[PDB]
Design a protein around this ligand. Sequence first.
Ligand SMILES: CC(=O)N[C@@H]1[C@@H](O)[C@H](O)[C@@H](CO)O[C@H]1O
Ligand SMILES: CC(=O)N[C@@H]1[C@@H](O)[C@H](O)[C@@H](CO)O[C@H]1O
Length: 361
Amino acid sequence: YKLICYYTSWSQYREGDGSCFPDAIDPFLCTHVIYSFANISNNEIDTWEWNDVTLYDTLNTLKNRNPKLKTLLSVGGWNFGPERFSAIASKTQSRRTFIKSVPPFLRTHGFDGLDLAWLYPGRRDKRHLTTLVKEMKAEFIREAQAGTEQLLLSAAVSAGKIAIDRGYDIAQISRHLDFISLLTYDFHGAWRQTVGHHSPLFAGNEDASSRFSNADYAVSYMLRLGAPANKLVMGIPTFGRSFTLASSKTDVGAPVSGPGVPGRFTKEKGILAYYEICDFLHGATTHRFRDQQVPYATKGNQWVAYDDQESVKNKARYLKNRQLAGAMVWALDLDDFRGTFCGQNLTFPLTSAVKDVLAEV
Ligand SMILES: CC(=O)N[C@@H]1[C@@H](O)[C@H](O)[C@@H](CO)O[C@H]1O
Ligand SMILES: CC(=O)N[C@@H]1[C@@H](O)[C@H](O)[C@@H](CO)O[C@H]1O
């Protein structure tokens, strides 16, 4: 099984224990580690933070300890406009420029592959998104003629039924991608004035309609669309989403007035790192959606949807039972990487939990 783990560059600026560097990563934890967000400049893949080539370096040395490790640089991201991605893909010229600029870049920095994080292509981009994947992979094939191991190519893909139908020619791009990562953690959130869990596993017979909003549906659909199970990798979050309640109500559907207060370390509203969630639990009331098998806690006017060790192990058994290629953990830097925030001293509890399951039969 594969364990694709994301590391975000901007997690370096978090204060105190929040601060996270490539060197803080267990090199035997994952099978592939993806560095979060390179940019695009003058149609050429480029760096983002000032000290990226230093961190690229830090990160890639981990292979000195674990030679089986593979690293990938991911382009796009959120703070990266999809229009930009769009303007580039639609002009065979600007597109071709970008492509020819990629191999050398990764080769110079020690990466084994590129990861496309085009964040949500439109109805208009589907055709181009396909061309990009194709020609890009055609380039990676032609560049291995030089005797070096062929660079890998992957994409982080939306898990929303509408999004998939709108801008993804799945049957086509599965043939060129070494693996596809499903963003199976963005089902609630996106501003929706009722409370809810963002990464539910199952449907759960409750205040329904959103039938397609759960890893399980997302997955089945991908398979129905022609994507081979051995190329699918299911996303498992390491963060929780918060909500400032609008009333003393807590159960499903409870009214929400806006996102939650920021985490002292992550400083972004509506989101809490697993380790911050570990601290939050103290003095909180835990709950479990038995139908969807994912928990939530509450304390004061704060409601949090998150994933813990059991929920995570569960999703892990699931992908194994449907025979997928593996799991994907978003934000290794949001897990208890120091292993000193969540009690029982284990470094990277959530990711470890997943690894243990993947390591059983
Ligand atoms: C963080 C950073 O460096 N971003 C730059 C930015 O000036 C620009 O939006 C983009 C377009 O060329 O190029 C990026 O590399
Ligand atoms: C639209 C965009 O994001 N690109 C900006 C551009 O306005 C700026 O002049 C240049 C570097 O200074 O690249 C980015 O900073």
